[PDB]
Amino acid sequence: SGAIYVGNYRVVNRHLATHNDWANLVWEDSSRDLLVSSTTAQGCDTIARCDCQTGVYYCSSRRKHYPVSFSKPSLIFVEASEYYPARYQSHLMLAVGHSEPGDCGGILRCQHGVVGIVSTGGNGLVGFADVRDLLWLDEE
Ligand SMILES: NC(=O)[C@H]1CCCN(C(=O)Cc2cnccc2C(F)(F)F)C1
Ligand SMILES: [Zn+2]
């Protein structure tokens, strides 16, 4: 579990969005596993606008932040689960790091800000949904 709070927006994994997030929907993309909802309170996270490939992510299954090297956002094949059939998820970045079911929503950060959130994983890999191309998160 976990979310990004920037401006008047709440960014979450689409598969973990609540019925309230859908009522307050701003934008969603099933192919990216992302959902953005509106908030009454202003958030304090800053989104990174860079091409960094190294950062630090939060791993809830270990209660630890780990430094990682990660790939550029790409179309990556993800196995079927209770949330989606087998498909390609877009804007996904992979790293060698621990993750287990329950870890989605952990923040990946670099020196410039929030890069993304955990969205996939398995076999000593962890996948992050990139948010650095969503330039509109900085305005209105
Ligand atoms: N983006 C998706 O399709 C997710 C939806 C939930 C399921 N999913 C996973 O990969 C779940 C997973 C499995 N093994 C290790 C780590 C994980 C976790 F980090 F929690 F994602 C795909
Ligand atoms: Zn950066």
PDB file of all heavy atoms in Angstrom, residues 5-40:
ATOM      1  N   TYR A   5       1.286  12.246  -2.878  1.00  0.00           N
ATOM      2  CA  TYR A   5       0.394  13.391  -2.667  1.00  0.00           C
ATOM      3  C   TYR A   5       1.098  14.653  -3.174  1.00  0.00           C
ATOM      4  O   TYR A   5       2.022  15.132  -2.526  1.00  0.00           O
ATOM      5  CB  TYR A   5      -0.004  13.530  -1.181  1.00  0.00           C
ATOM      6  CG  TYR A   5      -0.769  12.323  -0.670  1.00  0.00           C
ATOM      7  CD1 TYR A   5      -0.109  11.260  -0.067  1.00  0.00           C
ATOM      8  CD2 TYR A   5      -2.147  12.229  -0.822  1.00  0.00           C
ATOM      9  CE1 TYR A   5      -0.801  10.140   0.379  1.00  0.00           C
ATOM     10  CE2 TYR A   5      -2.851  11.123  -0.360  1.00  0.00           C
ATOM     11  CZ  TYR A   5      -2.175  10.084   0.253  1.00  0.00           C
ATOM     12  OH  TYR A   5      -2.850   8.951   0.654  1.00  0.00           O
ATOM     13  N   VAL A   6       0.751  15.116  -4.392  1.00  0.00           N
ATOM     14  CA  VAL A   6       1.341  16.313  -5.015  1.00  0.00           C
ATOM     15  C   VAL A   6       0.223  17.295  -5.362  1.00  0.00           C
ATOM     16  O   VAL A   6      -0.775  16.884  -5.951  1.00  0.00           O
ATOM     17  CB  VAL A   6       2.202  15.988  -6.261  1.00  0.00           C
ATOM     18  CG1 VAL A   6       1.442  15.147  -7.286  1.00  0.00           C
ATOM     19  CG2 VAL A   6       2.756  17.267  -6.893  1.00  0.00           C
ATOM     20  N   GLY A   7       0.353  18.576  -4.979  1.00  0.00           N
ATOM     21  CA  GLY A   7      -0.708  19.554  -5.246  1.00  0.00           C
ATOM     22  C   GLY A   7      -2.051  19.117  -4.699  1.00  0.00           C
ATOM     23  O   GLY A   7      -2.114  18.624  -3.568  1.00  0.00           O
ATOM     24  N   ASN A   8      -3.116  19.138  -5.541  1.00  0.00           N
ATOM     25  CA  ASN A   8      -4.388  18.635  -5.092  1.00  0.00           C
ATOM     26  C   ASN A   8      -4.629  17.279  -5.741  1.00  0.00           C
ATOM     27  O   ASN A   8      -5.724  17.003  -6.227  1.00  0.00           O
ATOM     28  CB  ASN A   8      -5.534  19.613  -5.378  1.00  0.00           C
ATOM     29  CG  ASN A   8      -5.537  20.785  -4.444  1.00  0.00           C
ATOM     30  OD1 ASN A   8      -6.149  20.772  -3.366  1.00  0.00           O
ATOM     31  ND2 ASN A   8      -4.893  21.820  -4.865  1.00  0.00           N
ATOM     32  N   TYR A   9      -3.590  16.411  -5.767  1.00  0.00           N
ATOM     33  CA  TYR A   9      -3.733  15.089  -6.394  1.00  0.00           C
ATOM     34  C   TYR A   9      -3.204  13.967  -5.515  1.00  0.00           C
ATOM     35  O   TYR A   9      -2.212  14.154  -4.803  1.00  0.00           O
ATOM     36  CB  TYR A   9      -2.946  15.020  -7.708  1.00  0.00           C
ATOM     37  CG  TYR A   9      -3.375  15.995  -8.775  1.00  0.00           C
ATOM     38  CD1 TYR A   9      -2.494  16.946  -9.271  1.00  0.00           C
ATOM     39  CD2 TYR A   9      -4.628  15.904  -9.359  1.00  0.00           C
ATOM     40  CE1 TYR A   9      -2.869  17.819 -10.281  1.00  0.00           C
ATOM     41  CE2 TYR A   9      -5.013  16.768 -10.374  1.00  0.00           C
ATOM     42  CZ  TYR A   9      -4.131  17.723 -10.835  1.00  0.00           C
ATOM     43  OH  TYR A   9      -4.521  18.582 -11.832  1.00  0.00           O
ATOM     44  N   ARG A  10      -3.829  12.797  -5.626  1.00  0.00           N
ATOM     45  CA  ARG A  10      -3.445  11.563  -4.947  1.00  0.00           C
ATOM     46  C   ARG A  10      -3.178  10.543  -6.050  1.00  0.00           C
ATOM     47  O   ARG A  10      -4.077  10.238  -6.834  1.00  0.00           O
ATOM     48  CB  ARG A  10      -4.574  11.079  -4.025  1.00  0.00           C
ATOM     49  CG  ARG A  10      -4.373   9.668  -3.478  1.00  0.00           C
ATOM     50  CD  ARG A  10      -5.481   9.319  -2.506  1.00  0.00           C
ATOM     51  NE  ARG A  10      -5.977   7.947  -2.684  1.00  0.00           N
ATOM     52  CZ  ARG A  10      -5.543   6.899  -1.991  1.00  0.00           C
ATOM     53  NH1 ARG A  10      -4.559   7.041  -1.104  1.00  0.00           N
ATOM     54  NH2 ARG A  10      -6.053   5.694  -2.211  1.00  0.00           N
ATOM     55  N   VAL A  11      -1.940  10.047  -6.132  1.00  0.00           N
ATOM     56  CA  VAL A  11      -1.543   9.087  -7.151  1.00  0.00           C
ATOM     57  C   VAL A  11      -1.420   7.708  -6.514  1.00  0.00           C
ATOM     58  O   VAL A  11      -0.635   7.532  -5.595  1.00  0.00           O
ATOM     59  CB  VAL A  11      -0.196   9.460  -7.789  1.00  0.00           C
ATOM     60  CG1 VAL A  11       0.145   8.505  -8.937  1.00  0.00           C
ATOM     61  CG2 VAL A  11      -0.176  10.927  -8.243  1.00  0.00           C
ATOM     62  N   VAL A  12      -2.155   6.743  -7.007  1.00  0.00           N
ATOM     63  CA  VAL A  12      -2.144   5.379  -6.443  1.00  0.00           C
ATOM     64  C   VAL A  12      -2.036   4.324  -7.536  1.00  0.00           C
ATOM     65  O   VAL A  12      -2.296   4.617  -8.703  1.00  0.00           O
ATOM     66  CB  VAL A  12      -3.446   5.134  -5.620  1.00  0.00           C
ATOM     67  CG1 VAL A  12      -3.523   6.101  -4.460  1.00  0.00           C
ATOM     68  CG2 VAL A  12      -4.686   5.242  -6.504  1.00  0.00           C
ATOM     69  N   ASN A  13      -1.734   3.057  -7.152  1.00  0.00           N
ATOM     70  CA  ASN A  13      -1.821   1.931  -8.077  1.00  0.00           C
ATOM     71  C   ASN A  13      -3.314   1.780  -8.447  1.00  0.00           C
ATOM     72  O   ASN A  13      -4.166   1.655  -7.551  1.00  0.00           O
ATOM     73  CB  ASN A  13      -1.345   0.615  -7.410  1.00  0.00           C
ATOM     74  CG  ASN A  13       0.133   0.599  -7.081  1.00  0.00           C
ATOM     75  OD1 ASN A  13       0.551   0.978  -5.974  1.00  0.00           O
ATOM     76  ND2 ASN A  13       0.966   0.200  -8.048  1.00  0.00           N
ATOM     77  N   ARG A  14      -3.629   1.745  -9.737  1.00  0.00           N
ATOM     78  CA  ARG A  14      -5.038   1.646 -10.177  1.00  0.00           C
ATOM     79  C   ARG A  14      -5.740   0.447  -9.566  1.00  0.00           C
ATOM     80  O   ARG A  14      -6.904   0.554  -9.182  1.00  0.00           O
ATOM     81  CB  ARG A  14      -5.138   1.649 -11.709  1.00  0.00           C
ATOM     82  CG  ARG A  14      -6.576   1.688 -12.275  1.00  0.00           C
ATOM     83  CD  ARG A  14      -6.533   1.279 -13.728  1.00  0.00           C
ATOM     84  NE  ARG A  14      -7.784   1.545 -14.450  1.00  0.00           N
ATOM     85  CZ  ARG A  14      -8.743   0.636 -14.629  1.00  0.00           C
ATOM     86  NH1 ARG A  14      -8.628  -0.578 -14.102  1.00  0.00           N
ATOM     87  NH2 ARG A  14      -9.831   0.939 -15.331  1.00  0.00           N
ATOM     88  N   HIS A  15      -5.002  -0.697  -9.399  1.00  0.00           N
ATOM     89  CA  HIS A  15      -5.616  -1.897  -8.834  1.00  0.00           C
ATOM     90  C   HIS A  15      -5.929  -1.810  -7.334  1.00  0.00           C
ATOM     91  O   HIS A  15      -6.706  -2.634  -6.833  1.00  0.00           O
ATOM     92  CB  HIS A  15      -4.786  -3.155  -9.162  1.00  0.00           C
ATOM     93  CG  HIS A  15      -3.529  -3.291  -8.359  1.00  0.00           C
ATOM     94  ND1 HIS A  15      -2.345  -2.694  -8.761  1.00  0.00           N
ATOM     95  CD2 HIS A  15      -3.293  -4.013  -7.232  1.00  0.00           C
ATOM     96  CE1 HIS A  15      -1.433  -3.045  -7.865  1.00  0.00           C
ATOM     97  NE2 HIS A  15      -1.946  -3.838  -6.926  1.00  0.00           N
ATOM     98  N   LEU A  16      -5.383  -0.805  -6.643  1.00  0.00           N
ATOM     99  CA  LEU A  16      -5.638  -0.550  -5.218  1.00  0.00           C
ATOM    100  C   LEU A  16      -6.535   0.718  -5.005  1.00  0.00           C
ATOM    101  O   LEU A  16      -6.730   1.149  -3.863  1.00  0.00           O
ATOM    102  CB  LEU A  16      -4.314  -0.419  -4.441  1.00  0.00           C
ATOM    103  CG  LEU A  16      -3.346  -1.633  -4.503  1.00  0.00           C
ATOM    104  CD1 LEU A  16      -2.064  -1.356  -3.708  1.00  0.00           C
ATOM    105  CD2 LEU A  16      -4.039  -2.949  -4.023  1.00  0.00           C
ATOM    106  N   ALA A  17      -7.046   1.334  -6.087  1.00  0.00           N
ATOM    107  CA  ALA A  17      -7.870   2.541  -5.949  1.00  0.00           C
ATOM    108  C   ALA A  17      -9.202   2.200  -5.215  1.00  0.00           C
ATOM    109  O   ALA A  17      -9.712   1.097  -5.367  1.00  0.00           O
ATOM    110  CB  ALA A  17      -8.162   3.119  -7.322  1.00  0.00           C
ATOM    111  N   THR A  18      -9.684   3.112  -4.347  1.00  0.00           N
ATOM    112  CA  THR A  18     -10.947   2.904  -3.610  1.00  0.00           C
ATOM    113  C   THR A  18     -12.138   3.400  -4.448  1.00  0.00           C
ATOM    114  O   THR A  18     -11.935   4.158  -5.402  1.00  0.00           O
ATOM    115  CB  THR A  18     -10.914   3.674  -2.270  1.00  0.00           C
ATOM    116  OG1 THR A  18     -10.793   5.073  -2.521  1.00  0.00           O
ATOM    117  CG2 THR A  18      -9.797   3.221  -1.354  1.00  0.00           C
ATOM    118  N   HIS A  19     -13.410   3.032  -4.070  1.00  0.00           N
ATOM    119  CA  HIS A  19     -14.588   3.548  -4.788  1.00  0.00           C
ATOM    120  C   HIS A  19     -14.609   5.116  -4.711  1.00  0.00           C
ATOM    121  O   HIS A  19     -15.021   5.772  -5.665  1.00  0.00           O
ATOM    122  CB  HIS A  19     -15.903   2.913  -4.245  1.00  0.00           C
ATOM    123  CG  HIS A  19     -16.245   3.382  -2.874  1.00  0.00           C
ATOM    124  ND1 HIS A  19     -17.397   4.114  -2.629  1.00  0.00           N
ATOM    125  CD2 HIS A  19     -15.535   3.279  -1.727  1.00  0.00           C
ATOM    126  CE1 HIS A  19     -17.338   4.455  -1.349  1.00  0.00           C
ATOM    127  NE2 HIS A  19     -16.228   3.989  -0.767  1.00  0.00           N
ATOM    128  N   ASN A  20     -14.082   5.702  -3.621  1.00  0.00           N
ATOM    129  CA  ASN A  20     -13.963   7.147  -3.451  1.00  0.00           C
ATOM    130  C   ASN A  20     -12.982   7.774  -4.440  1.00  0.00           C
ATOM    131  O   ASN A  20     -13.123   8.949  -4.783  1.00  0.00           O
ATOM    132  CB  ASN A  20     -13.445   7.478  -2.059  1.00  0.00           C
ATOM    133  CG  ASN A  20     -14.388   7.129  -0.949  1.00  0.00           C
ATOM    134  OD1 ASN A  20     -15.614   7.078  -1.120  1.00  0.00           O
ATOM    135  ND2 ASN A  20     -13.825   6.904   0.228  1.00  0.00           N
ATOM    136  N   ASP A  21     -11.928   7.034  -4.816  1.00  0.00           N
ATOM    137  CA  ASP A  21     -10.953   7.523  -5.786  1.00  0.00           C
ATOM    138  C   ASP A  21     -11.629   7.637  -7.154  1.00  0.00           C
ATOM    139  O   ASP A  21     -11.346   8.581  -7.884  1.00  0.00           O
ATOM    140  CB  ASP A  21      -9.747   6.564  -5.898  1.00  0.00           C
ATOM    141  CG  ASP A  21      -8.699   6.703  -4.811  1.00  0.00           C
ATOM    142  OD1 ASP A  21      -8.338   7.849  -4.477  1.00  0.00           O
ATOM    143  OD2 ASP A  21      -8.224   5.660  -4.309  1.00  0.00           O
ATOM    144  N   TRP A  22     -12.501   6.670  -7.507  1.00  0.00           N
ATOM    145  CA  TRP A  22     -13.232   6.686  -8.771  1.00  0.00           C
ATOM    146  C   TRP A  22     -14.253   7.837  -8.820  1.00  0.00           C
ATOM    147  O   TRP A  22     -14.308   8.561  -9.820  1.00  0.00           O
ATOM    148  CB  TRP A  22     -13.917   5.352  -8.986  1.00  0.00           C
ATOM    149  CG  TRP A  22     -12.957   4.289  -9.419  1.00  0.00           C
ATOM    150  CD1 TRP A  22     -12.429   3.293  -8.655  1.00  0.00           C
ATOM    151  CD2 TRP A  22     -12.425   4.120 -10.734  1.00  0.00           C
ATOM    152  NE1 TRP A  22     -11.586   2.512  -9.415  1.00  0.00           N
ATOM    153  CE2 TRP A  22     -11.573   2.995 -10.700  1.00  0.00           C
ATOM    154  CE3 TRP A  22     -12.557   4.830 -11.932  1.00  0.00           C
ATOM    155  CZ2 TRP A  22     -10.865   2.566 -11.820  1.00  0.00           C
ATOM    156  CZ3 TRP A  22     -11.890   4.375 -13.050  1.00  0.00           C
ATOM    157  CH2 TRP A  22     -11.058   3.248 -12.986  1.00  0.00           C
ATOM    158  N   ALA A  23     -14.934   8.102  -7.701  1.00  0.00           N
ATOM    159  CA  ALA A  23     -15.832   9.264  -7.619  1.00  0.00           C
ATOM    160  C   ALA A  23     -15.089  10.591  -7.789  1.00  0.00           C
ATOM    161  O   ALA A  23     -15.659  11.575  -8.274  1.00  0.00           O
ATOM    162  CB  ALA A  23     -16.567   9.251  -6.292  1.00  0.00           C
ATOM    163  N   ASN A  24     -13.824  10.649  -7.338  1.00  0.00           N
ATOM    164  CA  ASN A  24     -13.007  11.849  -7.440  1.00  0.00           C
ATOM    165  C   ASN A  24     -11.903  11.679  -8.499  1.00  0.00           C
ATOM    166  O   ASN A  24     -10.817  12.233  -8.357  1.00  0.00           O
ATOM    167  CB  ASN A  24     -12.414  12.174  -6.070  1.00  0.00           C
ATOM    168  CG  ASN A  24     -13.481  12.511  -5.059  1.00  0.00           C
ATOM    169  OD1 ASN A  24     -14.085  13.582  -5.104  1.00  0.00           O
ATOM    170  ND2 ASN A  24     -13.764  11.603  -4.138  1.00  0.00           N
ATOM    171  N   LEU A  25     -12.192  10.895  -9.554  1.00  0.00           N
ATOM    172  CA  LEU A  25     -11.266  10.582 -10.629  1.00  0.00           C
ATOM    173  C   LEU A  25     -10.862  11.786 -11.453  1.00  0.00           C
ATOM    174  O   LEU A  25     -11.709  12.596 -11.837  1.00  0.00           O
ATOM    175  CB  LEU A  25     -11.887   9.507 -11.542  1.00  0.00           C
ATOM    176  CG  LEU A  25     -11.097   9.115 -12.782  1.00  0.00           C
ATOM    177  CD1 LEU A  25      -9.790   8.377 -12.392  1.00  0.00           C
ATOM    178  CD2 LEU A  25     -11.938   8.275 -13.724  1.00  0.00           C
ATOM    179  N   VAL A  26      -9.550  11.902 -11.716  1.00  0.00           N
ATOM    180  CA  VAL A  26      -8.950  12.914 -12.556  1.00  0.00           C
ATOM    181  C   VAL A  26      -8.462  12.245 -13.860  1.00  0.00           C
ATOM    182  O   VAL A  26      -8.693  12.764 -14.956  1.00  0.00           O
ATOM    183  CB  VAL A  26      -7.757  13.587 -11.827  1.00  0.00           C
ATOM    184  CG1 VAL A  26      -7.046  14.558 -12.748  1.00  0.00           C
ATOM    185  CG2 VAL A  26      -8.205  14.280 -10.549  1.00  0.00           C
ATOM    186  N   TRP A  27      -7.767  11.084 -13.729  1.00  0.00           N
ATOM    187  CA  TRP A  27      -7.195  10.364 -14.855  1.00  0.00           C
ATOM    188  C   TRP A  27      -6.808   8.955 -14.406  1.00  0.00           C
ATOM    189  O   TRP A  27      -6.348   8.775 -13.282  1.00  0.00           O
ATOM    190  CB  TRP A  27      -5.943  11.113 -15.353  1.00  0.00           C
ATOM    191  CG  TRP A  27      -5.047  10.362 -16.302  1.00  0.00           C
ATOM    192  CD1 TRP A  27      -5.111  10.363 -17.664  1.00  0.00           C
ATOM    193  CD2 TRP A  27      -3.913   9.555 -15.955  1.00  0.00           C
ATOM    194  NE1 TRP A  27      -4.100   9.591 -18.187  1.00  0.00           N
ATOM    195  CE2 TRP A  27      -3.350   9.082 -17.158  1.00  0.00           C
ATOM    196  CE3 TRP A  27      -3.309   9.202 -14.745  1.00  0.00           C
ATOM    197  CZ2 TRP A  27      -2.203   8.295 -17.185  1.00  0.00           C
ATOM    198  CZ3 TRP A  27      -2.171   8.416 -14.776  1.00  0.00           C
ATOM    199  CH2 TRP A  27      -1.641   7.959 -15.982  1.00  0.00           C
ATOM    200  N   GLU A  28      -6.992   7.969 -15.278  1.00  0.00           N
ATOM    201  CA  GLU A  28      -6.575   6.602 -14.987  1.00  0.00           C
ATOM    202  C   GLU A  28      -6.098   5.927 -16.261  1.00  0.00           C
ATOM    203  O   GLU A  28      -6.585   6.231 -17.365  1.00  0.00           O
ATOM    204  CB  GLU A  28      -7.664   5.782 -14.270  1.00  0.00           C
ATOM    205  CG  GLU A  28      -9.028   5.779 -14.959  1.00  0.00           C
ATOM    206  CD  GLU A  28      -9.215   4.778 -16.083  1.00  0.00           C
ATOM    207  OE1 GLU A  28      -8.510   3.742 -16.098  1.00  0.00           O
ATOM    208  OE2 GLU A  28     -10.084   5.028 -16.952  1.00  0.00           O
ATOM    209  N   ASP A  29      -5.136   5.015 -16.123  1.00  0.00           N
ATOM    210  CA  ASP A  29      -4.629   4.279 -17.266  1.00  0.00           C
ATOM    211  C   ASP A  29      -4.353   2.842 -16.820  1.00  0.00           C
ATOM    212  O   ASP A  29      -3.379   2.589 -16.117  1.00  0.00           O
ATOM    213  CB  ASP A  29      -3.394   4.976 -17.844  1.00  0.00           C
ATOM    214  CG  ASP A  29      -2.897   4.423 -19.162  1.00  0.00           C
ATOM    215  OD1 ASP A  29      -3.197   3.239 -19.463  1.00  0.00           O
ATOM    216  OD2 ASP A  29      -2.179   5.161 -19.883  1.00  0.00           O
ATOM    217  N   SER A  30      -5.221   1.899 -17.224  1.00  0.00           N
ATOM    218  CA  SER A  30      -5.065   0.491 -16.860  1.00  0.00           C
ATOM    219  C   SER A  30      -3.722  -0.073 -17.384  1.00  0.00           C
ATOM    220  O   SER A  30      -3.040  -0.828 -16.685  1.00  0.00           O
ATOM    221  CB  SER A  30      -6.235  -0.319 -17.414  1.00  0.00           C
ATOM    222  OG  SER A  30      -6.049  -1.697 -17.172  1.00  0.00           O
ATOM    223  N   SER A  31      -3.330   0.318 -18.608  1.00  0.00           N
ATOM    224  CA  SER A  31      -2.058  -0.171 -19.172  1.00  0.00           C
ATOM    225  C   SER A  31      -0.819   0.248 -18.339  1.00  0.00           C
ATOM    226  O   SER A  31       0.204  -0.389 -18.446  1.00  0.00           O
ATOM    227  CB  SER A  31      -1.903   0.229 -20.639  1.00  0.00           C
ATOM    228  OG  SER A  31      -1.439   1.564 -20.749  1.00  0.00           O
ATOM    229  N   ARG A  32      -0.920   1.296 -17.525  1.00  0.00           N
ATOM    230  CA  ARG A  32       0.187   1.775 -16.656  1.00  0.00           C
ATOM    231  C   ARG A  32      -0.023   1.408 -15.161  1.00  0.00           C
ATOM    232  O   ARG A  32       0.849   1.711 -14.329  1.00  0.00           O
ATOM    233  CB  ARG A  32       0.251   3.314 -16.723  1.00  0.00           C
ATOM    234  CG  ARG A  32       0.507   3.893 -18.095  1.00  0.00           C
ATOM    235  CD  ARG A  32       0.622   5.398 -18.052  1.00  0.00           C
ATOM    236  NE  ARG A  32       1.831   5.821 -17.339  1.00  0.00           N
ATOM    237  CZ  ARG A  32       2.499   6.943 -17.593  1.00  0.00           C
ATOM    238  NH1 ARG A  32       2.093   7.764 -18.562  1.00  0.00           N
ATOM    239  NH2 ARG A  32       3.602   7.240 -16.902  1.00  0.00           N
ATOM    240  N   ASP A  33      -1.188   0.823 -14.808  1.00  0.00           N
ATOM    241  CA  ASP A  33      -1.539   0.535 -13.403  1.00  0.00           C
ATOM    242  C   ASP A  33      -1.543   1.818 -12.574  1.00  0.00           C
ATOM    243  O   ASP A  33      -1.209   1.766 -11.400  1.00  0.00           O
ATOM    244  CB  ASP A  33      -0.655  -0.562 -12.724  1.00  0.00           C
ATOM    245  CG  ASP A  33      -1.116  -0.918 -11.286  1.00  0.00           C
ATOM    246  OD1 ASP A  33      -2.347  -1.087 -11.070  1.00  0.00           O
ATOM    247  OD2 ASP A  33      -0.238  -1.074 -10.385  1.00  0.00           O
ATOM    248  N   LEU A  34      -2.000   2.984 -13.162  1.00  0.00           N
ATOM    249  CA  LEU A  34      -2.032   4.232 -12.367  1.00  0.00           C
ATOM    250  C   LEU A  34      -3.448   4.832 -12.315  1.00  0.00           C
ATOM    251  O   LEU A  34      -4.180   4.727 -13.286  1.00  0.00           O
ATOM    252  CB  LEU A  34      -1.096   5.324 -12.928  1.00  0.00           C
ATOM    253  CG  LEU A  34       0.424   5.115 -12.760  1.00  0.00           C
ATOM    254  CD1 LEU A  34       1.181   6.247 -13.427  1.00  0.00           C
ATOM    255  CD2 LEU A  34       0.834   5.064 -11.298  1.00  0.00           C
ATOM    256  N   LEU A  35      -3.763   5.513 -11.223  1.00  0.00           N
ATOM    257  CA  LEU A  35      -5.001   6.258 -11.030  1.00  0.00           C
ATOM    258  C   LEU A  35      -4.659   7.508 -10.237  1.00  0.00           C
ATOM    259  O   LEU A  35      -3.901   7.447  -9.265  1.00  0.00           O
ATOM    260  CB  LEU A  35      -6.079   5.438 -10.307  1.00  0.00           C
ATOM    261  CG  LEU A  35      -7.490   6.112 -10.207  1.00  0.00           C
ATOM    262  CD1 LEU A  35      -8.609   5.091 -10.466  1.00  0.00           C
ATOM    263  CD2 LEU A  35      -7.682   6.747  -8.855  1.00  0.00           C
ATOM    264  N   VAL A  36      -5.205   8.652 -10.669  1.00  0.00           N
ATOM    265  CA  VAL A  36      -5.002   9.917  -9.990  1.00  0.00           C
ATOM    266  C   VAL A  36      -6.368  10.434  -9.575  1.00  0.00           C
ATOM    267  O   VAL A  36      -7.266  10.490 -10.405  1.00  0.00           O
ATOM    268  CB  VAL A  36      -4.270  10.955 -10.875  1.00  0.00           C
ATOM    269  CG1 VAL A  36      -4.153  12.305 -10.162  1.00  0.00           C
ATOM    270  CG2 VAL A  36      -2.890  10.436 -11.277  1.00  0.00           C
ATOM    271  N   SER A  37      -6.538  10.731  -8.285  1.00  0.00           N
ATOM    272  CA  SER A  37      -7.779  11.291  -7.770  1.00  0.00           C
ATOM    273  C   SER A  37      -7.518  12.697  -7.173  1.00  0.00           C
ATOM    274  O   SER A  37      -6.374  13.102  -6.941  1.00  0.00           O
ATOM    275  CB  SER A  37      -8.437  10.353  -6.762  1.00  0.00           C
ATOM    276  OG  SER A  37      -7.591  10.113  -5.651  1.00  0.00           O
ATOM    277  N   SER A  38      -8.581  13.469  -7.011  1.00  0.00           N
ATOM    278  CA  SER A  38      -8.494  14.830  -6.492  1.00  0.00           C
ATOM    279  C   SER A  38      -8.523  14.820  -4.962  1.00  0.00           C
ATOM    280  O   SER A  38      -9.168  13.961  -4.370  1.00  0.00           O
ATOM    281  CB  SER A  38      -9.670  15.658  -7.016  1.00  0.00           C
ATOM    282  OG  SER A  38     -10.870  15.186  -6.436  1.00  0.00           O
ATOM    283  N   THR A  39      -7.872  15.786  -4.321  1.00  0.00           N
ATOM    284  CA  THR A  39      -7.861  15.860  -2.857  1.00  0.00           C
ATOM    285  C   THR A  39      -8.269  17.248  -2.356  1.00  0.00           C
ATOM    286  O   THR A  39      -7.919  18.248  -2.988  1.00  0.00           O
ATOM    287  CB  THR A  39      -6.467  15.513  -2.288  1.00  0.00           C
ATOM    288  OG1 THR A  39      -5.554  16.574  -2.544  1.00  0.00           O
ATOM    289  CG2 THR A  39      -5.923  14.202  -2.816  1.00  0.00           C
ATOM    290  N   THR A  40      -8.875  17.316  -1.170  1.00  0.00           N
ATOM    291  CA  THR A  40      -9.204  18.619  -0.567  1.00  0.00           C
ATOM    292  C   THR A  40      -7.984  19.271   0.070  1.00  0.00           C
ATOM    293  O   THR A  40      -7.836  20.498   0.043  1.00  0.00           O
ATOM    294  CB  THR A  40     -10.363  18.497   0.427  1.00  0.00           C
ATOM    295  OG1 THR A  40     -10.148  17.353   1.265  1.00  0.00           O
ATOM    296  CG2 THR A  40     -11.708  18.345  -0.278  1.00  0.00           C
TER     297      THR A  40
END
